[PDB]
Symmetry: C4
Subunit: 31 residues, 4 copies
Amino acid sequence: MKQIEDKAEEILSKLYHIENELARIKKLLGE
Amino acid sequence: MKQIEDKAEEILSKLYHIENELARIKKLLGE
Amino acid sequence: MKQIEDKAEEILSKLYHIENELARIKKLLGE
Amino acid sequence: MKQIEDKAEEILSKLYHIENELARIKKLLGE
Ligand SMILES: [Cl-]
Ligand SMILES: [Cl-]
């Protein structure tokens, strides 16, 4: 459970990374 | 635990957003 | 909990979708 | 529950794979 929250956090932190990599690809293609 | 269900919701919702990003990308590539 | 498993399943099913959309973009760019 | 922790692991691992896809993409775009 405290380990669950650690894994939740890693999961969110990967999910913002991915959002953000994707946002930068969309920006580039749209240039 | 509904804290854990809460987190799963928050997860999916991020994944929905990610899928919208990729729908924009795919259009910009004419898919 | 049975609802947790439902949300897990949706989460996996979005994650394979995303993997797969991404695999098809990589294929296209690499052509 | 370690079934739930198990699932979270399986989640992250998919997200790692997704990040590898996007590293290939980004290179193909010369980022
Ligand atoms: Cl939901
Ligand atoms: Cl892990």
